[PDB]
Structures are given as structure tokens and as C-alpha cells.
Design a protein around this ligand. Structure first.
Ligand SMILES: Cc1ccc(CNC(=O)C2CCC2)cn1
Length: 171
């Protein structure tokens, strides 16, 4: 069976217990922590492209009110995010399974922009998601996996200083 697991879940859970925040910039900001995924059960000889996207976890705008994150009252539908293709794609199963697949080069922005960077809505909550796409073969297949542990709110600057501190302590 194709098995997908989160590397360094320990550390993600520290961020999650405080409510994680990720900075977004007009040019794009790399994520910390970085999403690293353990994959087994691929055909070492089959070809796969790894895709990363961000699901809007709810339909609300969030605000840091008196030291606490709280959702707005006025939900709007959230158009799905664009997909980031791992730069190592497309590649053999063996390649993907020899070390954690690390999305270190994805950049999160708040502005519609040339290419690469993924645009998110500031003050929305996001759940990272990957797609493993079997390519080249006749039988195209997709396996998707969500990472609740890696939920965050997109912010233009950190609101919770406990997050600012953890981000520096562990980088
Ligand atoms: C950074 C980068 C790497 C590879 C590619 C090639 N396209 C794919 O792999 C498609 C996604 C499913 C097939 C484009 N961009």
C-alpha cells in the first residue's frame, strides 16, 4: 500500500498547539517549518510528479483579538489554491523513497504573480495537501494526502510572539 507520513511531526505539533502562522509577501516567502514527507509503497521503476496545494480549512477571515485567533462572522467561498510542482519532478519511485520529499523552495505570496509562488488569502487558515501523480505509464493515478499537523493561518506579519520565538528557536 502507498504510505505517506509527515517527517518531524513532533516539531509541527509544537507550532500547531500555538496556532501556526506562515508569512506571505508580494514576492513570496519560503515556509518554516518546511513540509517534509516520507513515502513508501511506490513502484521504484514507475514515474511520479509530486504536487503541493493548500486547502482553505474553513471559509472565514481570522483576526488576532486580545491574544487569541477568532473567526469572522461572514464566510465567503474559497477558490482552491494553485498547485506547486516539486522541482525534482518528474522522477522514479526510487528517487522519491530514498529521502524525505522536502518542499523547501515553495514560496507563499498574497499577490497574483508570474510563476512558482503560490498565492494565498492573508488571514485564512490553510491545510497543506500533496498529490502523488503516476505519470508516463498508460494508467495515470493520483493519491492525495492532507497534513492536519501543518495547518497554519497566512499572515503578513506574526501576531502571536510565541510563534515568532518558536520559528527562531528551531531554524
Ligand atoms: C517544477 C516543475 C517540475 C516538473 C514539471 C513537469 N510537469 C509535471 O510533472 C506535471 C505535474 C503532473 C505532471 C513542471 N514544473
Amino acid at each position: 500500500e502507498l504510505r505517506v507520513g509527515l517527517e518531524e511531526s513532533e516539531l509541527w505539533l509544537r507550532f500547531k498547539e500555538l496556532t501556526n502562522e506562515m508569512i506571505v509577501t508580494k514576492n513570496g516567502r519560503r515556509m518554516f517549518p518546511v513540509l517534509k514527507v516520507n513515502v513508501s509503497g511506490l513502484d521504484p521503476n514507475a514515474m511520479y510528479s509530486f504536487l503541493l496545494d493548500f486547502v482553505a480549512a474553513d471559509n472565514h477571515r481570522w483576526k488576532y483579538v486580545n491574544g487569541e485567533w477568532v473567526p469572522g462572522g461572514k464566510p465567503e467561498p474559497q477558490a482552491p489554491s494553485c498547485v506547486y510542482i516539486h522541482p525534482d519532478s518528474p522522477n522514479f519511485g526510487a528517487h522519491w523513497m530514498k529521502a524525505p520529499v522536502s518542499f523547501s523552495k515553495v514560496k507563499l505570496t498574497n499577490k497574483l504573480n508570474g510563476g512558482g509562488q503560490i498565492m494565498l488569502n492573508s488571514l485564512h487558515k490553510y491545510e497543506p495537501r500533496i498529490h502523488i501523480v503516476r505519470v508516463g505509464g498508460p494508467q495515470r493515478m493520483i493519491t492525495s494526502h492532507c497534513f492536519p499537523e501543518t495547518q497554519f493561518i497566512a499572515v503578513t506579519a506574526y501576531q502571536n510572539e510565541e510563534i515568532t520565538a518558536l520559528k527562531i528557536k528551531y531554524n
